Design a protein around this ligand. Structure first.
Ligand code: EMC
Ligand code: EMC
Ligand code: NA
Ligand code: NA
Lengths: 176, 180
């Protein structure tokens, strides 16, 4: 059913609504001081080569694991699965984490844009709907920054070294 | 004289380059040790060796400083140092660190802002013993040095508190090359 227009519209609508929340809402992660001057998040333009199908390889025996955080004690996740996918000509894997009380898998990553400074230095996050082992949708046009990227003092989970993708993921949120 | 003082400072900078350049425990990442060409300093200027009024905390309090990585660092607020640079008066808060006899004085100045010295600020060690209020202690900004993370390693170093900004160009002690 889903048209390309529908998908692009959905992404557009999401980035606009998000901008609105960040710019005006009391619980916005943008520090109050900087809200007036806030001009919207920066994004790569939408790109379908970064909207890929991932093979879902669930953890045989889901394991309690922890990720470093930027300002705090390590955060506790369950290793939930391996996501396997292709970007252009190369195959990649990312570990997906189960978060208590959240239905989507948490997939923090870094890529070559992390390294060259086009995207956030500590990396980016992707949410992935597990429902219900087979193939899931990996849309890096939906990659977003951790809260701490906006100046406030938040302790956020850091991507494991194993979740670096050796490729330029020119999709999703950037920092300009 | 100024000569013994200059010599001692010059000796310290040399020995420190030596250590950074060749020692296994150097904060210079192993990858860059061979290319390493020494730290960078402003020339030794006696106008930045000032007498500071020691004003000890009446009731020293546990405080926290933000760090470059990981949780805040825990220190005790031990004293205010008040001093003049050069026609203007300033105060810096000095911190007592567990197990170290010298007070820790992390700071920033206009060289931080203009990019001539390290972006996160610089550190100064000050020997408190055995001064009362208000005895003088020597504040020698020629001895200002960089946090470990200035060299590229992924260290956790304490950030100077906001009120430890000195509104002046402290052209003494360790500097950085911005072009690198
Ligand atoms: C972006 C979660 Hg602190
Ligand atoms: C310079 C302390 Hg990591
Ligand atoms: Na976030
Ligand atoms: Na240091």
């Amino acid at each position: 059913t889903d048209t390309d227009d529908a998908w692009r519209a959905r992404i557009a609508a999401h980035r606009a609504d998000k901008d609105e929340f960040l710019a005006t809402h009391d619980q916005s992660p943008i520090p109050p001081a900087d809200r007036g001057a806030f001009d919207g998040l920066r994004y790569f333009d939408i790109d379908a080569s970064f909207r890929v199908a991932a093979r879902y390889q669930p953890a045989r025996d889901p394991e309690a694991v922890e990720l470093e955080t930027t300002r705090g004690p390590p955060a506790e996740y369950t290793r939930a699965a391996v996501l396997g996918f292709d970007l252009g000509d190369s195959h990649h894997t990312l570990t997906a984490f189960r978060v208590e009380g959240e239905s989507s898998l948490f997939v923090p990553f870094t890529d070559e844009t992390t390294d060259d400074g086009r995207t956030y230095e500590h990396g980016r996050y992707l949410d992935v709907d597990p429902a219900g082992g087979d193939e899931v949708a990996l849309d890096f046009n939906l990659a977003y920054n951790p809260f701490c990227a906006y100046g406030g003092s938040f302790s956020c989970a850091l991507p494991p070294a194993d979740n670096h993708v050796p490729a330029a993921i020119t999709a999703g949120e950037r920092v300009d």
